[PDB]
Scaffold this active site. Structure first.
Site, PDB file in Angstrom:
ATOM      1  N   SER A   1       0.859  -1.217   0.000  1.00 24.59           N
ATOM      2  CA  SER A   1       0.000   0.000   0.000  1.00 24.59           C
ATOM      3  C   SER A   1       0.877   1.243   0.000  1.00 24.59           C
ATOM      4  O   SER A   1       0.419   2.267  -0.514  1.00 24.59           O
ATOM      5  CB  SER A   1      -0.988   0.013   1.154  1.00 24.59           C
ATOM      6  OG  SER A   1      -0.343   0.035   2.429  1.00 24.59           O
TER       7      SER A   1
ATOM      8  N   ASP B   1      15.901   3.114   2.168  1.00 26.61           N
ATOM      9  CA  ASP B   1      15.477   4.044   3.238  1.00 26.61           C
ATOM     10  C   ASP B   1      15.124   5.371   2.558  1.00 26.61           C
ATOM     11  O   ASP B   1      15.908   5.840   1.730  1.00 26.61           O
ATOM     12  CB  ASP B   1      16.593   4.185   4.253  1.00 26.61           C
ATOM     13  CG  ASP B   1      16.178   4.853   5.552  1.00 26.61           C
ATOM     14  OD1 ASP B   1      15.787   6.018   5.523  1.00 26.61           O
ATOM     15  OD2 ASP B   1      16.285   4.213   6.580  1.00 26.61           O
TER      16      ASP B   1
ATOM     17  N   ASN C   1      19.089  -0.797  15.594  1.00 30.44           N
ATOM     18  CA  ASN C   1      18.741   0.070  16.731  1.00 30.44           C
ATOM     19  C   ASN C   1      17.688  -0.616  17.601  1.00 30.44           C
ATOM     20  O   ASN C   1      16.629  -1.007  17.066  1.00 30.44           O
ATOM     21  CB  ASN C   1      18.227   1.416  16.220  1.00 30.44           C
ATOM     22  CG  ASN C   1      19.269   2.160  15.410  1.00 30.44           C
ATOM     23  OD1 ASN C   1      20.472   2.019  15.663  1.00 30.44           O
ATOM     24  ND2 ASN C   1      18.805   2.967  14.478  1.00 30.44           N
TER      25      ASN C   1
ATOM     26  N   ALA D   1      18.004   5.019  19.298  1.00 25.65           N
ATOM     27  CA  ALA D   1      17.313   5.849  18.282  1.00 25.65           C
ATOM     28  C   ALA D   1      16.522   4.958  17.303  1.00 25.65           C
ATOM     29  O   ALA D   1      16.474   5.274  16.142  1.00 25.65           O
ATOM     30  CB  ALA D   1      18.331   6.708  17.580  1.00 25.65           C
ATOM     31  N   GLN D   2      15.873   3.889  17.788  1.00 22.22           N
ATOM     32  CA  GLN D   2      14.963   3.066  16.952  1.00 22.22           C
ATOM     33  C   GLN D   2      13.749   3.927  16.577  1.00 22.22           C
ATOM     34  O   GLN D   2      13.086   4.430  17.483  1.00 22.22           O
ATOM     35  CB  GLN D   2      14.536   1.803  17.683  1.00 22.22           C
ATOM     36  CG  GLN D   2      13.765   0.855  16.793  1.00 22.22           C
ATOM     37  CD  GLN D   2      13.388  -0.461  17.415  1.00 22.22           C
ATOM     38  OE1 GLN D   2      13.729  -0.743  18.560  1.00 22.22           O
ATOM     39  NE2 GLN D   2      12.729  -1.307  16.624  1.00 22.22           N
ATOM     40  N   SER D   3      13.506   4.140  15.292  1.00 24.25           N
ATOM     41  CA  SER D   3      12.393   5.005  14.799  1.00 24.25           C
ATOM     42  C   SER D   3      11.115   4.167  14.700  1.00 24.25           C
ATOM     43  O   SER D   3      10.151   4.515  15.335  1.00 24.25           O
ATOM     44  CB  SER D   3      12.752   5.646  13.493  1.00 24.25           C
ATOM     45  OG  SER D   3      13.194   4.650  12.566  1.00 24.25           O
ATOM     46  N   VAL D   4      11.148   3.030  14.022  1.00 23.51           N
ATOM     47  CA  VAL D   4       9.966   2.150  13.779  1.00 23.51           C
ATOM     48  C   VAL D   4      10.126   0.877  14.618  1.00 23.51           C
ATOM     49  O   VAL D   4      11.190   0.252  14.563  1.00 23.51           O
ATOM     50  CB  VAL D   4       9.876   1.817  12.270  1.00 23.51           C
ATOM     51  CG1 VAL D   4       8.682   0.927  11.944  1.00 23.51           C
ATOM     52  CG2 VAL D   4       9.858   3.087  11.432  1.00 23.51           C
TER      53      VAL D   4
ATOM     54  N   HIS E   1      14.546  -3.965  12.013  1.00 20.42           N
ATOM     55  CA  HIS E   1      15.182  -3.686  10.709  1.00 20.42           C
ATOM     56  C   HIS E   1      16.692  -3.592  10.890  1.00 20.42           C
ATOM     57  O   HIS E   1      17.151  -3.039  11.907  1.00 20.42           O
ATOM     58  CB  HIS E   1      14.568  -2.430  10.060  1.00 20.42           C
ATOM     59  CG  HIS E   1      14.543  -1.236  10.926  1.00 20.42           C
ATOM     60  ND1 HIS E   1      13.665  -1.124  11.985  1.00 20.42           N
ATOM     61  CD2 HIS E   1      15.265  -0.090  10.882  1.00 20.42           C
ATOM     62  CE1 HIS E   1      13.852   0.053  12.581  1.00 20.42           C
ATOM     63  NE2 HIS E   1      14.873   0.698  11.928  1.00 20.42           N
ATOM     64  N   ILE E   2      17.406  -4.113   9.914  1.00 17.80           N
ATOM     65  CA  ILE E   2      18.859  -3.903   9.752  1.00 17.80           C
ATOM     66  C   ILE E   2      19.041  -2.791   8.715  1.00 17.80           C
ATOM     67  O   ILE E   2      18.611  -2.965   7.558  1.00 17.80           O
ATOM     68  CB  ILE E   2      19.548  -5.189   9.298  1.00 17.80           C
ATOM     69  CG1 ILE E   2      19.140  -6.383  10.162  1.00 17.80           C
ATOM     70  CG2 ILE E   2      21.059  -4.971   9.303  1.00 17.80           C
ATOM     71  CD1 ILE E   2      19.868  -7.671   9.770  1.00 17.80           C
TER      72      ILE E   2
HETATM   73  C1  LIG Z   1      13.411   6.622   7.827  1.00 18.29           C
HETATM   74 AS1  LIG Z   1      14.332   5.409   9.144  1.00 18.29          AS
HETATM   75  C2  LIG Z   1      13.259   3.764   8.918  1.00 18.29           C
HETATM   76  O1  LIG Z   1      16.032   5.209   8.709  1.00 18.29           O
HETATM   77  O2  LIG Z   1      14.369   5.998  10.834  1.00 18.29           O
END
Ligand SMILES: C[As](C)(=O)[O-]
Lengths: 113, 113
Positions: B13, B30, B86, B92-95, B99-100
């Site tokens: 989506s 990214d 992260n 500083a993990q955003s999502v 994820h690597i």
């Molecule tokens: C836009 As990101 C997933 O590197 O914090």
């Protein structure tokens, strides 16, 4: 033919502050720490860099990440931390033996170098 | 788990530049790149953070590192790169979907944030 400095940590020729050991890997504190908690997770199998890991290393690589997070928890990193793997020159890889850096005990910045 | 922005990348989506996909994971660029090459390797299983991976995730975690290095090679990162995971606020993990980060095409600095 001679192995790296990490082979001499593994065979205990060089003293290190060892947090964890099993038949697959070893965890020890970094002597040039970049954070209040900074340790290294290394395989006993001397894979020189992540770019040279192969399909047969799948289970070991998963074990290294589980040991990294188990050890982060034992070291009290409950408010977050960072895992780093450096490959080659542009990664600033110091020792050509695969290692995961675990950094915690401060706010890590973005970008990560 | 609550839906994240990664749920919308996974169900297609939210359009992304997808480099690789299999049963276990997805790889996409990214959208706020921190290097000339910056992509993310995510599992399809929504592990929120590496601190919440469990022993049963061993094979998946190894697969994520092998896909990271296979994709780094396909993206031309033969002079080195950095993998970053992260965890939580200090990482500083955003999502809150594992994820690597794979970063290359410039000299990464030390410390890694
Ligand atoms: C836009 As990101 C997933 O590197 O914090």
């Amino acid at each position: 033919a001679a192995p790296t400095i990490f082979s001499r940590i593994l065979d205990k020729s060089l003293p290190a502050d060892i947090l964890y050991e099993d038949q697959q890997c070893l965890v020890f504190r970094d002597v040039a720490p970049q954070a209040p908690v900074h340790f290294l997770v290394i395989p006993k199998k001397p894979i020189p860099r992540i770019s040279q890991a192969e399909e047969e290393d799948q289970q070991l690589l998963g074990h290294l990440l589980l040991v990294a997070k188990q050890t982060a928890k034992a070291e009290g990193l409950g408010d977050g931390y960072r895992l780093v793997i450096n490959d080659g020159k542009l990664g600033a890889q110091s020792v050509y033996h695969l290692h995961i850096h675990v950094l915690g005990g401060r706010q890590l910045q973005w970008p990560p170098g």
